[PDB]
Amino acid sequence: LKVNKAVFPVAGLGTRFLPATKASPKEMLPVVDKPLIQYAVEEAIAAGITEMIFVTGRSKRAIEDHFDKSYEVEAELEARGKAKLLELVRSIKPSHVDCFYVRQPEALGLGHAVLCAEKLVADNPFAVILADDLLDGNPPVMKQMVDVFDHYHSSVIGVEEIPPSETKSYGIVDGKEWEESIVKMSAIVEKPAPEVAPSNLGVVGRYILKPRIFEHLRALKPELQLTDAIQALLADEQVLAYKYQGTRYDCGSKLGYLKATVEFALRHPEVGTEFDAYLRTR
Numbered sequence: 001l002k003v004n005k006a007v008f009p010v011a012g013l014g015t016r017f018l019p020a021t022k023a024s025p026k027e028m029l030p031v032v033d034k035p036l037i038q039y040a041v042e043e044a045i046a047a048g049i050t051e052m053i054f055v056t057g058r059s060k061r062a063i064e065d066h067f068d069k070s071y072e073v074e075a076e077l078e079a080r081g082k083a084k085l086l087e088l089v090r091s092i093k094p095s096h097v098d099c100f101y102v103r104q105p106e107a108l109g110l111g112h113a114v115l116c117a118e119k120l121v122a123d124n125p126f127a128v129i130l131a132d133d134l135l136d137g138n139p140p141v142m143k144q145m146v147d148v149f150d151h152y153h154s155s156v157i158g159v160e161e162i163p164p165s166e167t168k169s170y171g172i173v174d175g176k177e178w179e180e181s182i183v184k185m186s187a188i189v190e191k192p193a194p195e196v197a198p199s200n201l202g203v204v205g206r207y208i209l210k211p212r213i214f215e216h217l218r219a220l221k222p223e224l225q226l227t228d229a230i231q232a233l234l235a236d237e238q239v240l241a242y243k244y245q246g247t248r249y250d251c252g253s254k255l256g257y258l259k260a261t262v263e264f265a266l267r268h269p270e271v272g273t274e275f276d277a278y279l280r281t282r
């Protein structure tokens, strides 16, 4: 049917960004002036998703207070007639967008984080969006994928072409190329050595999953691997890999985070020009 829900796992330990992540999850890191998780939610909104499910771990309130109403900030902005900033703050969570929270008690990995959201997804297809993967696309990547899902009504795994030497960092898909950008998947293999990688198509943190993924998650022998659930699912039904149009910034790591900051600052209306001039003359 329709993709109304997006699950955002934001419960990782984020040790690669200590000390900043001590009391704020990695997905709250700002790129210029905006947390990763807000970029991710805005992508979901652009895709027609209206229900945001956050799987929280440590520092859940950074996520919750970012999206929930804050009386203090509005009373502060109200008391100063700063109306454009008020519209900006309110657009963090537009009307008709709902935020639900669920706890992952133990940082038992991504597949387990997804499993924590099972009762909230129930018997519906749902997006899984990893805000650490900051995707820059027009149209937004999850919107592209929702269009793919609406056509084929199969799970959709976002993929990008990666250097063959780097396959050990990625889930790698295999299958029959269907369109220029659609692979009908025959396999997904977790972090293969370059010489045995079945393709150069690496999985990124964008998924549309049909609810049968949950029975394969609960069934796995435990850190449950999302890859293994996907591999199991494609034995029972079509799963598609989608070579999205756009650019991924691996903000799980410091370098991708920095690249994202640079690239997004350059396209920022307020500071783009000066930051470009600064970069040239430094």
Ligand SMILES: O=c1ccn([C@@H]2O[C@H](COP(=O)(O)OP(=O)(O)OP(=O)(O)O)[C@@H](O)[C@H]2O)c(=O)[nH]1
Residues within 6 Å of the ligand: 008, 009, 010, 011, 012, 013, 014, 015, 016, 017, 026, 055, 057, 104, 106, 107, 108, 109, 110, 113, 129, 130, 131, 132, 252
């Ligand atoms: O227990 C977990 C682990 C990971 N995740 C989620 O899975 C995705 C991938 O996150 P990772 O598993 O790569 O962990 P991390 O980047 O937070 O950890 P460090 O390497 O910085 O130590 C992110 O969306 C994260 O929030 C969970 O929700 N729960």
